[PDB]
Structure 1
Amino acid sequence: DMNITVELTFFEPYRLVEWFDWDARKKSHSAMRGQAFAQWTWKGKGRTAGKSFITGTLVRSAVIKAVEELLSLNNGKWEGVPCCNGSFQTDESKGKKPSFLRKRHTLQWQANNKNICDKEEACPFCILLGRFDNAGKVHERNKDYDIHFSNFDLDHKQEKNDLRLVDIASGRILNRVDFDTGKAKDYFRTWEADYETYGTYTGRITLRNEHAKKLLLASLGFVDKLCGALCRIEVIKSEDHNDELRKQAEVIVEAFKQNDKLEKIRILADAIRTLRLHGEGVIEKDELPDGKEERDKGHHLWDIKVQGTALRTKLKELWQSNKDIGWRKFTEMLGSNLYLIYKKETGGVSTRFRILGDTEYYSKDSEGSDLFIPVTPPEGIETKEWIIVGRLKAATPFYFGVQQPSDSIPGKEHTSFNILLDKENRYRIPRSALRGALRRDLRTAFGSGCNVSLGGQILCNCKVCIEMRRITLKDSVSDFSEPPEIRYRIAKNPGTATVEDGSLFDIEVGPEGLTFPFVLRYRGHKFPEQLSSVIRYWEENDGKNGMAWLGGLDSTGKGRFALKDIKIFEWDLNQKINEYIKERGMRGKEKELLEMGESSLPDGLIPYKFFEERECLFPYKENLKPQWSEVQYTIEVGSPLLTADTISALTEPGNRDAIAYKKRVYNDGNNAIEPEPRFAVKSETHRGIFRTAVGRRTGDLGKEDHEDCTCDMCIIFGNEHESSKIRFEDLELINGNEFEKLEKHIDHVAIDRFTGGALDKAKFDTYPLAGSPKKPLKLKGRFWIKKGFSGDHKLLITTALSDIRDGLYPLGSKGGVGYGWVAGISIDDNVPDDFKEMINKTGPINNDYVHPGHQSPKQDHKNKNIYYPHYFLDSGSKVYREKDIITHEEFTEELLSGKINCKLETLTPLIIPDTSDENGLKLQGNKPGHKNYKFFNINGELMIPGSELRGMLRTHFEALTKSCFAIFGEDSTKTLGGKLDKALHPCTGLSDGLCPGCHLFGTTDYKGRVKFGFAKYENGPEWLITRGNNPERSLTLGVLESPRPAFSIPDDESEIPGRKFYLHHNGWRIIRQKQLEIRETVQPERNVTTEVMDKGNVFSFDVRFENLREWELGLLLQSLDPGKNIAHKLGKGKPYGFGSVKIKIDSLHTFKIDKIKRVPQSDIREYINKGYQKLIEWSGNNVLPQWHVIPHIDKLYKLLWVPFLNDSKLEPDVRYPVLNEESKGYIEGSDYTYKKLGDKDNLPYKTRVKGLTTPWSPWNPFQ
């Protein structure tokens, strides 16, 4: 006749559902699915607030299950008194069915209680069931219940108004994953409720019979799960801040849109999101990247005026106004609001329609099939419970998927892929992901299993489900609350080798080395060998690495966890059940069990000593160990490496455009992350490299679609319908400690084809990793191969690895100018034997063409003529554009691919400056503003950048092939674009075709087919020594100012002359003997001091080509080496005379898709002869080729003709006029100044345009 008060507390996020009584419950699917959850009722009207509870029928069901299990443990008796089997069937003829029907098996025992149970006298199990009571199946009054369970109300700790649903629950989509395809079958939604603050419930249980009190109080402590969570049953005796952020975001977007810079706002949004990675000090103490020094315009975007103030100052005021919401919420809300205003202003708001429905399936009821299945254990049987406590460690960056925000709202963006987090922004491994991975690995270890059927009246009797019905897990929350890492991903068009439209997206990843708790519980008669094998497979030891794949980016290698600190404990349930009821099974106190010693264990909990090792387990090493095979290798890169990041470069000091990619690694010894980040090449990148290599080798990239496809590429690397059979991981730099100044600063500029100088807003920098041929970078990478790979597919993967070793696929960006070129590969000894066997089993040439140089200026009069240093080349203004563009999707059989090994000899001193160090040698201590440099070098080894050689060969090739002006600026003086012809305009788009220079060297929407490597110094005397200089080398140059088009095109009715070229002359000796007169009479800020290399030095470089036609390779070999007495100009000081270089073709190799050819000297003459006929055909005016027959090629080659190569003491004088007489540097009676040469009386304009267009025309006598 006494009541008891029961408190129910949770230790996991439990499950909530909306309340419907009995028929509206049948109306809804979520209500019928969530019948064993907590129930939520709306309070008041408006559907915003309510209260949750737990029905007493569910607690009664859990209690009678615990009573049944306790009586089945102790042979049908409890504390000496026997209990019968009870009744669990209901006849339809007498009475109705009791509103819930049981499908599981019912534990039974041999019933010997001397009697049958009637109303007068009954066993504790019979009165605890409530059989012989006055009330049943229709509620009349709260009395005449022998045992009554009340509703369990949510114990709100402090009284307030009505509790809202969004404060307690949060929706989440759960999944069902197909085992054979690795793909989701369907999904369903549920409400996960808070347990830290809303995890206590209170109810009353009324007994009116002091004969089942001991059994009830014993089984209250045996109840372990309720509402999807571990539980203990005991008995007792900033919405306003968002609107101002929206208004300030509106002000920022409008201030950006007024300056015609709206599209930066998107980028700015990402940057503000990246500000959550840094602290508040980056806005407080002005750690944001400033502009370049002495520049009136500041940063690229952080110094944009918003209402008259800079964006950094506006952001500082916005942070000072909102200090109460925290740094992280401020940056996240600001970025989200900026992204929302940008998406509103653009006009596209992401419609997202699904045809043919939305695959959300809830389980259903079929009538009939009311079964009662008794299970009777043997008398002698011994039941135990094993608890495995340990720790999951992320060996890779992980990913646990979740929906977008504003979709996980139970009552009713910027990041495409979010990660699952807690309410305190902690990383979370849910119970369902662990349970699914354990089910998958148990199906692998058993070898057979069932796909999970949802509508079932009969329990599945497969081995996996039988073992999984006695496995209990627990969700894990890390002790880390730092924000995730945004990793960006693109997709590539195989035709043009550029990015596809709408292929940028981003993922949120967690740090590797993170650490989560792990609890497993198994209640049964013997510990299975397959579960032991799955635990041994998941854990890691010396040598072995863990193989616990949890999460949802497994093909990218994301989510491979490893189990450590494993302790298995055993509880005897037959002898020490009272200690289990007393200690509540150590539920909620498993953290204490890890650091617990031997002498502090509770009574009944012993260590488990019979845990088998890896070698003694039969389903291990036959089912689990050959599941994935590791292939680990090391890429050796002897060139600079740049995988650009470009968002973190906007949020870091240095003011650099593109920087290398870095990772955040978490350490477990000290709870911080790492002091310095680790450089890496992403798993997406080399996964795409392998995929593109296999697809180009077989030909599967050329297909238009891969839906319902079974090609070798889709079999190996997965498709829509199947998961990938190969899983790639990151390439981490391992020799970064051997370098001094690991990151190198390399700057580039685009040169105008007409003016010959730098184009406006076309200067930029890169910060790659310093890779040199004599000190290369080493990246260690890994991939896993599933069992079932045939010999053809293993041959394909080893062929792709051989293609990567041979240098066909450079890593990172800017591969066409020599970045990321693979120098070698190494294969570790743990690679299997067949893969190792497949991977291990895999002269003076001249051109003899002599050009007849310009005989009238120099071969008539020896050294009495003065020539202008630059001349202009004019072509016919008719360019040929080809619309049948050669695609990169395959290696075509007719076309040629391979490499050219070439050597470069300096005829004149060469100036390639290293602009990484503006102080260079020394010499700014003596005087301020004097720019001095060293030669370009990486790790002390002298080098020429590949971009210089590529630009020089392109400027030769477009002039030879009559291409459009690729780099051209339309500016101040109508404009230069109007005077230029429409045909010579830069090619924009593939609709109107591509000119041959743009066909070979590429455009924005088409990748080039020639790649130029870094040249390396080999032989010869360096460092041209001059005595009167502060180093022995490094003579000081003179002024170098910007070119003026107004001299070239005066008097508006005058069209653009053409491409500017510089003559070959030894005018550097004049600078070399004027060193005393250069330091004086010239301001030290004006002139630059640079290191120089002497003539006769040799460099070596290679040009890699693919899909080349025969005439294109012939014209490339002609532009590399045009003939005897013809050379190129490269480097600084071309008008003063520096930088004449001559290129010799050492070797040519051509491959086919399986050997490397040598191609002797006869065939290269055939290629050059085939190239000559194409220019003959293009000219329209239809033997060893005489190139001067074509008109523009002779005018080109006389500009490139060296007048001092074969003995000739021909040494021409090449210089500029000196404005005004009376000017320093005047020659005695020359009458050679711009005042006397530019005044429409003396030189009549048209004569000046003729003088600038005819090469090597004398200018001081002025013929």
Structure 2
Amino acid sequence: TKGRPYITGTLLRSAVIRSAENLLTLSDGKISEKTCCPGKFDTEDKDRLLQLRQRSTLRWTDKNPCPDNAETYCPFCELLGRSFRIHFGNLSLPGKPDFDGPKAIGSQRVLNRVDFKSGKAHDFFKAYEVDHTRFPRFEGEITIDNKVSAEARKLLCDSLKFTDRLCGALCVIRFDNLAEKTAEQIISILDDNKKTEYTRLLADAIRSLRRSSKLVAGLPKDHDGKDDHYLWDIGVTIRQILTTSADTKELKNAGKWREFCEKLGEALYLKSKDMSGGLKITRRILGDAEFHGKPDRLEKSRSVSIGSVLKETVVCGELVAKTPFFFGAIDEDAKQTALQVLLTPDNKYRLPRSAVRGILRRDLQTYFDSPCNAELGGRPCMCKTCRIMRGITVMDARSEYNAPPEIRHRTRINPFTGTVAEGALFNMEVAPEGIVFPFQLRYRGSEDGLPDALKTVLKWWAEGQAFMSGAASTGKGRFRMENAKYETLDLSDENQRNDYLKNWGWRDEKGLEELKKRLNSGLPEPGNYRDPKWHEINVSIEMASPFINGDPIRAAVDKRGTAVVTFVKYKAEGEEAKPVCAYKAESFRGVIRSAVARIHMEDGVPLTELTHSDCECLLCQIFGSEYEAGKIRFEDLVFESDPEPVTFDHVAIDRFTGGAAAKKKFDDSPLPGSPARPLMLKGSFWIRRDVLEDEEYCKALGKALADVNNGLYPLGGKSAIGYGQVKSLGIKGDDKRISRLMNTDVAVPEKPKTDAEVRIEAEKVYYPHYFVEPHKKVEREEKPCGHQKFHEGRLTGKIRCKLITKTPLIVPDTSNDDFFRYHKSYAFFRLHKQIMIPGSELRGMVSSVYETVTNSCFRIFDETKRLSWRMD
């Protein structure tokens, strides 16, 4: 595969000829004092030609072309070669270097075609992308015969300056083994010490260290504060190997350290997959649909006059990420992460032209409300969208921010059990919000300024409705166009056109600085404005309880040694990352989707019991499926104010000994929330207007959101101990079309007086504890009640209880063991200066009585304990 890239002079000649036709239209076919033919573009032996023109030739005169046997040819026929006269050479990198293969200069990327109606791709194609920052310049020679007239050369030189794109990119044409070895040490340590259940967790946590090597020095210790962590001190230890790797001078560079953690995590990831010995599923399968366009070779040749009026409108601005975004690009080598983002070779984030055009084309069809059914090949489609898109140019954009992507872990819940489904865990790289991309759109055409469709589209983007990336259903890819400035250039005027040619259209960075001074602030106002497809709903959630959005990988890495930590995300501020706590969009979407699915049925079957593959139930119509994109988009919910996580610790009590059982530590670090200082969770989800105009769709969402508002769908984890309990949910921005559905006092009987009789004598001394002997029969059922629906004949609701102390109560605050000044001292448990009893304390207390009354099992019991007495 060794060699080098090059550009054919035939491809350059093709673009020059296309530019000459546009210039001859503006000059009405005149170059200086000579007039030009339409040219000849018809050959009888059409088989010899690799490609035939499918577009229509531009028309500037009605006269017949030059004769085949003519003494003189017009300047446009001289350019075509109907007179080598003008020979084009290949364009090569200067110096003729060599590279190992195509992957030494660039990377293949899949470019898909998305079906407009379904929102899903059904075919794709691939191409190598070679970064301009590494290989910017190709050099070549155009050979011109001396018998070529001056008017022809003037047309040629003006056409080179007019030619603005080639090979898919805007252009200016001028004429004049540590990870390998560390993986084995870690794997051997894991295998020697019989700790292989942690191979995947260690791989994910080590990969998260690529952010900075200073994370190694802060790796958590055990609850005692000593280097005895269950993961980093398994062995030397894993921590010492990581600490040695961090201190290595080779890994001192942040770029070298980042590659090391990625290679190490990938090596440990392969080993973890090899361990399992059951059924193995390929998740990404049946995905190859590589279809290439096929040009039509029996296409009718046409000559079309477009008129002498040509105006180019330049729009420069900024595309600012208001949410995390995901431009999907999966590397074949990397398998640890299921979903990856598109980055530049120097690890900068990228906003590609292919995605920008795809969003423009989709939005133009949305404005016209007219799908395009054109196929790849043939003459260009003549609908309003395709004709506008042929006048549109967008420049590929990259950021300054270059920090590693944050990886979000998504699961699928088994709806019958209420737990994670077997093997349903996958990763996704996520680009951060707050990134700024330099935006430049140019439109070329005969209208006065922009078309009304493009004025409305660019106004949509300026209002923050530029949804430009994948993963839209989980709130990825919303941009706003900011600092928009425009100026229309009149290419029909000869003075303006000569000035436009002289500066190569002001498209290079130097020329663009001059042009940005000429631009006027704002956007052209659309004469006929149409409302955007998506409408924003603002959601307010009040939480009088602690909240946690489980992030297991951050728990393993955070300097806090806690077992469970809350999800946090990073915002880009220039080239810095600012962490904030958030409720994940994926988690919130899953809860909302479950609330709809558990109360709706299709043909008597709950929607949770459906496979929802090749399905068109109510749930698939609103939330999408594997065949049709969803019509509702959930964003991350952030917290008003800045609550700081607090730590809670728990112990399981052996039902026989009555003391703390020997179990793995499961302390949690949730965000505090209380009735006095409730958590305020705010964000927005967007819903398509056709969904918002449908009475049955708004009815389905209103019923589900009524159950969330009534505290039936807690947010986050640890719901059993009192976390994530929603006090109220409100929505605004729907004209009450959904919120309209989101809206006796009998005394509780007194307890019976007990019949338990205990006789106590003052002279006796009694033991502090006694044992209740269980019945020998334990009633067990093989299948418990499923969670997939509200079953008929069952009961769902709330119990409100009052607890009163009869003797002094000690529920300690164990965060501070030296409260009253070794001799440990504790204060009573409180949250936000409010005296409380956590639900886990009350849960375990009542569970023990329930086990004894129902004669259940010993739920907490140290079975593997081995007793030992002493000989007498």
Tell me the amino acid that sits aligned with residue 707 of structure 2: D
3-state SS, counterpart of residue 647 of structure 1: helix
Asked if the contact 2:316/2:485 (under 8 Å) is kept, the reply is: yes
Which of residues 666, 679, 682 is equivalent to 2:572?
Answer: 666
- In the TM superposition, what whole-angstrom CA distance separates every residue of 1:731-783 from its partner, at most 9, and x where no partner exists? 110032xx6xx322211100001111111124431111111111111000221
Tell me the amino acid that sits aligned with residue 579 of structure 1: D
1:75 Cα deviation after fit: 0.4
Q: What does residue range 448-597 of structure 1 map to in structure 2 within 5 Å? A: 448-456=370-378, 458-526=379-447, 527-540=450-463, 546-575=464-493, 576-589=496-509, 592-593=512-513
Asked if the contact 1:178/1:451 (under 8 Å) is kept, the reply is: no
What's 1:151 paired with? 90
What's 2:679 paired with? 777
Which of residues 208, 221, 242 is equivalent to 1:315?
Answer: 242
Asked if the contact 1:635/1:824 (under 8 Å) is kept, the reply is: yes
How many Å separate the matches in 1 of 2:281 and 2:709? 45
Tell me the amino acid that sits aligned with residue 451 of structure 1: N
Which of residues 352, 360, 373 is equivalent to 1:430?
Answer: 352
1:229 Cα deviation after fit: 1.1
Distance 1:377 1:326, change over 3 A: closer
How many Å separate the matches in 2 of 1:327 and 1:353? 30
What's 1:175 paired with? 112
What's 1:849 paired with? 753
Cα RMSD after superposing both structures: 2.5
1:849 Cα deviation after fit: 2.9
Distance 1:940 1:839, change over 3 A: same
Distance 1:450 1:300, change over 3 A: same
1:214 Cα deviation after fit: 1.6
What's 1:695 paired with? 597
Which of residues 181, 199, 221 is equivalent to 1:265?
Answer: 199
How many Å separate the matches in 2 of 1:376 and 1:360? 37
Unaligned runs of 5+ in 2: none
Work out whether 1:342 is the aligned partner of 2:272.
Answer: yes
Asked if the contact 1:107/1:375 (under 8 Å) is kept, the reply is: yes
1:689 Cα deviation after fit: 1.1
Distance 1:883 1:89, change over 3 A: same
3-state SS, counterpart of residue 488 of structure 1: strand
Task: Report the TM-score, using the length of structure 1 for normalisation.
Answer: 0.65
What's 1:1123 paired with? none
What's 1:282 paired with? 215
What's 2:121 paired with? 184
What's 1:1177 paired with? none
What's 1:123 paired with? 74
Tell me the amino acid that sits aligned with residue 781 of structure 1: G
What's 1:75 paired with? 28
1:608 Cα deviation after fit: 8.8
Work out whether 1:944 is the aligned partner of 2:837.
Answer: yes
Q: What does residue range 219-238 of structure 1 map to in structure 2 within 5 Å? A: 219-236=159-176
Which is higher, the Rg of structure 1 or of structure 2?
1
What's 1:888 paired with? 787
Give the count of matched residue pairs: 853
Tell me the amino acid that sits aligned with residue 488 of structure 1: H
How many Å separate the matches in 2 of 1:919 and 1:816? 30
3-state SS, counterpart of residue 173 of structure 2: strand
3-state SS, counterpart of residue 361 of structure 1: coil
Which of residues 285, 305, 323 is equivalent to 1:376?
Answer: 305
How many Å separate the matches in 1 of 2:6 and 2:646? 64
Once the two structures are overlaid, the 10-residue window that deviates more, 557-566 or 784-793, is 784-793
Q: What does residue range 995-1006 of structure 1 map to in structure 2 within 5 Å? A: none
Asked which structure has the greater RCO (Cα within 8 Å, sep 6+), the reply is 2
1:349 Cα deviation after fit: 11
- In the TM superposition, what whole-angstrom CA distance separates every residue of 1:693-735 from its partner, at most 9, and x where no partner exists? 1111114334342223222112111112211121111111003
1:462 Cα deviation after fit: 1.0
How many Å separate the matches in 2 of 1:496 and 1:247? 42
How many Å separate the matches in 2 of 1:786 and 1:114? 54
3-state SS, counterpart of residue 118 of structure 2: coil
How many Å separate the matches in 1 of 2:225 and 2:164? 71
1:185 Cα deviation after fit: 1.3
1:160 Cα deviation after fit: 5.4
How many Å separate the matches in 2 of 1:417 and 1:269? 16
Distance 1:151 1:743, change over 3 A: closer
Distance 1:73 1:163, change over 3 A: farther
How many Å separate the matches in 2 of 1:166 and 1:498? 43
How many Å separate the matches in 2 of 1:767 and 1:916? 11
What's 2:228 paired with? 298
Q: What does residue range 1169-1248 of structure 1 map to in structure 2 within 5 Å? A: none
1:619 Cα deviation after fit: 4.1
1:76 Cα deviation after fit: 0.6
Q: Taking every aligned residue pair, what percent have the same amino acid on both sides?
A: 42
Work out whether 1:733 is the aligned partner of 2:639.
Answer: yes
Work out whether 1:765 is the aligned partner of 2:667.
Answer: yes
Q: What does residue range 823-1222 of structure 1 map to in structure 2 within 5 Å? A: 823-828=727-732, 830-840=733-743, 843=747, 845-855=749-759, 858=760, 862-920=761-819, 922-923=820-821, 929-973=822-866
Work out whether 1:723 is the aligned partner of 2:629.
Answer: yes
1:88 Cα deviation after fit: 1.1
- In the TM superposition, what whole-angstrom CA distance separates every residue of 1:1133-1161 from its partner, at most 9, and x where no partner exists? xxxxxxxxxxxxxxxxxxxxxxxxxxxxx
3-state SS, counterpart of residue 166 of structure 1: helix
Tell me the amino acid that sits aligned with residue 287 of structure 1: G
What's 1:1170 paired with? none
- In the TM superposition, what whole-angstrom CA distance separates every residue of 1:808-865 from its partner, at most 9, and x where no partner exists? 111111101111111223444x44233343335xx3631223314134xx2xxx3011
Distance 1:592 1:203, change over 3 A: closer
1:649 Cα deviation after fit: 2.1
Work out whether 1:417 is the aligned partner of 2:310.
Answer: no
How many Å separate the matches in 2 of 1:781 and 1:365? 48
Unaligned runs of 5+ in 1: 1-47, 133-144, 408-412, 541-545, 924-928, 976-1044, 1052-1238, 1240-1263
Tell me the amino acid that sits aligned with residue 227 of structure 1: C
Distance 1:228 1:900, change over 3 A: same
Q: What does residue range 14-93 of structure 1 map to in structure 2 within 5 Å? A: 48-92=1-45
Tell me the amino acid that sits aligned with residue 177 of structure 1: V
Asked if the contact 2:117/2:371 (under 8 Å) is kept, the reply is: no
Asked if the contact 2:116/2:371 (under 8 Å) is kept, the reply is: no
Task: Report the TM-score, using the length of structure 2 for normalisation.
Answer: 0.93
1:589 Cα deviation after fit: 2.2
Distance 1:848 1:711, change over 3 A: same
1:97 Cα deviation after fit: 4.9
Distance 1:149 1:331, change over 3 A: same
- In the TM superposition, what whole-angstrom CA distance separates every residue of 1:247-290 from its partner, at most 9, and x where no partner exists? 2211211111111111212211111111112x23334xx32223
- In the TM superposition, what whole-angstrom CA distance separates every residue of 1:501-560 from its partner, at most 9, and x where no partner exists? 1111111111111100111111111121001100000113xxxxx111111100001111
Distance 1:831 1:401, change over 3 A: same
Asked if the contact 1:343/1:349 (under 8 Å) is kept, the reply is: no
How many Å separate the matches in 1 of 2:670 and 2:288? 46
Asked if the contact 1:490/1:503 (under 8 Å) is kept, the reply is: yes
Tell me the amino acid that sits aligned with residue 363 of structure 1: G
1:639 Cα deviation after fit: 0.8
How many Å separate the matches in 2 of 1:747 and 1:351? 38
Asked if the contact 1:390/1:519 (under 8 Å) is kept, the reply is: yes
Tell me the amino acid that sits aligned with residue 83 of structure 1: C
Which of residues 121, 124, 134 is equivalent to 1:197?
Answer: 134
How many Å separate the matches in 2 of 1:953 and 1:333? 49
1:352 Cα deviation after fit: 4.1
